[PDB]
Amino acid sequence: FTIGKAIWLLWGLVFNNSVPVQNPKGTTSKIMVSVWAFFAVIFL
Amino acid sequence: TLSSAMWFSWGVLLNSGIGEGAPRSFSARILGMVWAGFAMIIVASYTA
C-alpha cells in the first residue's frame, strides 16, 4: 500500500511540493519525512 | 486541534504538505498567515 507510493512521496518531499501526495500514514514517521523536507530546503 | 495544529505549523516551517486543515476563524487565519509569512521570509533570507 505504501511500498509503491513511497518513492513518489519521498522524492516529492526532497524535490518540490508541486504534486499533491498521499503522505499521512504512520504519523510518527512525519518527523522523518519533515527532516527529509529539511534536506530538500537546504539542498535546493 | 492541539496535535494536528502543531504538526501543520511545523510542516509549514519546512514548506511541507503536512497539515490539511483550514482556519476556523479569521483570527486563526491571520495567525497562521503571519506564521507562514515569517517562515518563508526566513527561508528566503537563508538561501540568500
From Swiss-Prot, chain A:
Identify the residue ranges that face the Cytoplasmic compartment according to the record: 25-31
> What are the residue boundaries of the intramembrane regions?
5-24
Source domain of life: Eukaryota
- Region ranges (Pore-forming): 5-24
Could you list the residue ranges that cross the membrane?
Answer: 32-44
Post-translational modification note: Phosphorylated on tyrosine residues.
Q: What is the tissue localization of expression for this protein?
A: Expressed in the hippocampus including the dentate gyrus (at protein level). Detected in adult olfactory bulb, brain cortex, hippocampus, striatum, thalamus, superior colliculus, with much lower levels in inferior colliculus, midbrain and cerebellum.
Tell me where in or outside the cell this protein is found. Answer: Cell membrane; Postsynaptic cell membrane; Late endosome; Lysosome
Q: Location of site Functional determinant of NMDA receptors?
A: 16
Q: What is known of its domains?
A: The extracellular N-terminal domain (ATD/NTD) endows NMDARs with a unique capacity for allosteric modulation, harboring several binding sites for small molecule ligands that act as subunit-specific allosteric modulators of ion channel activity. A hydrophobic region that gives rise to the prediction of a transmembrane span does not cross the membrane, but is part of a discontinuously helical region that dips into the membrane and is probably part of the pore and of the selectivity filter.
Quaternary context: Heterotetramer. Forms heterotetrameric channels composed of two GluN1/zeta subunits (GRIN1), and two identical GluN2/epsilon subunits (GRIN2A, GRIN2B, GRIN2C or GRIN2D) or GluN3 subunits (GRIN3A or GRIN3B) (in vitro). Can also form heterotetrameric channels that contain at least two GluN1 subunits and at least two different GluN2 subunits (or a combination of one GluN2 and one GluN3 subunits) (in vitro). In vivo, the subunit composition may depend on the expression levels of the different subunits. Found in a complex with GRIN1, GRIN3A and PPP2CB. Found in a complex with GRIN1 and GRIN3B.
Similarity annotation: Belongs to the glutamate-gated ion channel (TC 1.A.10.1) family. NR2B/GRIN2B subfamily.
What is the annotated role of this protein in its UniProt record?
Answer: Component of N-methyl-D-aspartate (NMDA) receptors (NMDARs) that function as heterotetrameric, ligand-gated cation channels with high calcium permeability and voltage-dependent block by Mg(2+). Participates in synaptic plasticity for learning and memory formation by contributing to the long-term depression (LTD) of hippocampus membrane currents. Channel activation requires binding of the neurotransmitter L-glutamate to the GluN2 subunit, glycine or D-serine binding to the GluN1 subunit, plus membrane depolarization to eliminate channel inhibition by Mg(2+).
- Protein's recorded name: Glutamate receptor ionotropic, NMDA 2B
Q: From which organism does this entry originate? A: Rattus norvegicus (Rat)
Per UniProt, what is the name of the gene that codes for the protein in this document? Grin2b
Parent-protein residues present: 600 to 643 of 1482
Curated annotation (Swiss-Prot), chain B:
Transmembrane ranges, per UniProt, are 30-46
Spell out which residues lie on the membrane's Cytoplasmic side: 24-29
Name the tissues where it is expressed: Detected throughout the brain, in brain cortex, cerebellum, thalamus and olfactory bulb.
Annotated region (Pore-forming), positions in chain:
2-23
Show intramembrane residue spans.
2-23
Q: Where in the cell is it found?
A: Cell membrane; Postsynaptic cell membrane; Synaptic cell membrane; Postsynaptic density membrane
Q: Describe PTMs of this protein.
A: NMDA is probably regulated by C-terminal phosphorylation of an isoform of NR1 by PKC. Its phosphorylated state is influenced by the formation of the NMDAR-PPP2CB complex and the NMDAR channel activity.
Q: According to its UniProt record, which protein family does this protein belong to? A: Belongs to the glutamate-gated ion channel (TC 1.A.10.1) family. NR1/GRIN1 subfamily.
Q: What is known of its domains?
A: A hydrophobic region that gives rise to the prediction of a transmembrane span does not cross the membrane, but is part of a discontinuously helical region that dips into the membrane and is probably part of the pore and of the selectivity filter. The extracellular N-terminal domain (ATD) is a site of allosteric regulation to modulate overall receptor function.
On assembly, the entry states:
Heterotetramer; the NMDAR subunits are modular and harbor tiered domains that function in concert to regulate opening and closing of the cation-selective ion channel pore. Forms heterotetrameric channels composed of two GluN1/zeta subunits (GRIN1), and two identical GluN2/epsilon subunits (GRIN2A, GRIN2B, GRIN2C or GRIN2D) or GluN3 subunits (GRIN3A or GRIN3B) (in vitro). Can also form heterotetrameric channels that contain at least two GluN1 subunits and at least two different GluN2 subunits (or a combination of one GluN2 and one GluN3 subunits) (in vitro).
Q: What does this protein do?
A: Component of N-methyl-D-aspartate (NMDA) receptors (NMDARs) that function as heterotetrameric, ligand-gated cation channels with high calcium permeability and voltage-dependent block by Mg(2+). NMDARs participate in synaptic plasticity for learning and memory formation by contributing to the long-term potentiation (LTP). Channel activation requires binding of the neurotransmitter L-glutamate to the GluN2 subunit, glycine or D-serine binding to the GluN1 subunit, plus membrane depolarization to eliminate channel inhibition by Mg(2+).
User: What's the protein name?
Assistant: Glutamate receptor ionotropic, NMDA 1
Classification from the root reads: Eukaryota, Metazoa, Chordata, Craniata, Vertebrata
